[PDB]
């Protein structure tokens, strides 16, 4: 399938080269997979989600996304126009308040929630969790991310936006999950992207157009935007039968575009998420 005039990041995910604008992907499109977006919530009524999004948990007075961040990330995972996996089922878990903040104890509870809640959902092709959030190093936060992964969920987490080594941030520094840095449309490391040995992969993260609250759209930047590209890619590849929750991060690294990014510090992987789809 071909989506013309796609956001640059979608085109990038299906291309050996930067500078194109059509997204190519197998029409299965993540059908039968599920992606949890653990964030500020999801505006599930947005036409772009086509009834495939729902809130399943909140720790606050509402499950509504009063911020936009979670709706943007969910749109990159699976919205019809802005999403990588256009037929996945999206589940929102609101661990962040409408200012985008959240206590680590709530974030941990949300991760353990997903590990159990997947047993209440129909996801025959597999389960992914996208975590566009983080703060300073915490062994407890990393351990929660490790449990979620161990339970059979492909966990993708943002590297962070500190232009620093992600070893000092969580859950970015947990080795067993998929830590995602950000790149721009010219295949440069995004200026804010964290780096380091703990990164597994880069995805598009500068000037990413996606859904927003109020039935709108906007372009924003962050490793929060790169993470859902990788989460949606995992769901898509799992639906295709090419990999599993336990092996998807490694498979994405195996099949990534190699050596294409500039300003990658020595010791950080030079790997850019790529669906290797041949139309």
UniProtKB/Swiss-Prot annotation:
The gene is PROK. This is Proteinase K. Hydrolyzes keratin at aromatic and hydrophobic residues. It catalyses: Hydrolysis of keratin, and of other proteins with subtilisin-like specificity. Hydrolyzes peptide amides. One of its GO terms (cellular component) is extracellular region. Its cofactor is Ca(2+). Ca(2+) 2 binds at residues 16, 260. Residues 7-279 form the Peptidase S8 domain. GO terms for biological process: proteolysis. It is an enzyme of class 3 (hydrolase). Binds 2 calcium ions per subunit. Its EC number is 3.4.21.64. Ca(2+) 1 binds at residues 175, 177, 200. Keywords: Calcium, Disulfide bond, Hydrolase, Metal-binding, Protease, Serine protease, Signal, Zymogen. It comes from Parengyodontium album (Tritirachium album). The active site is at residues 39, 69, 224. The chain holds residues 106 to 384 of 384 of the full protein. Belongs to the peptidase S8 family. GO terms for molecular function: metal ion binding; serine-type endopeptidase activity. Disulfide bonds join 34-123, 178-249.
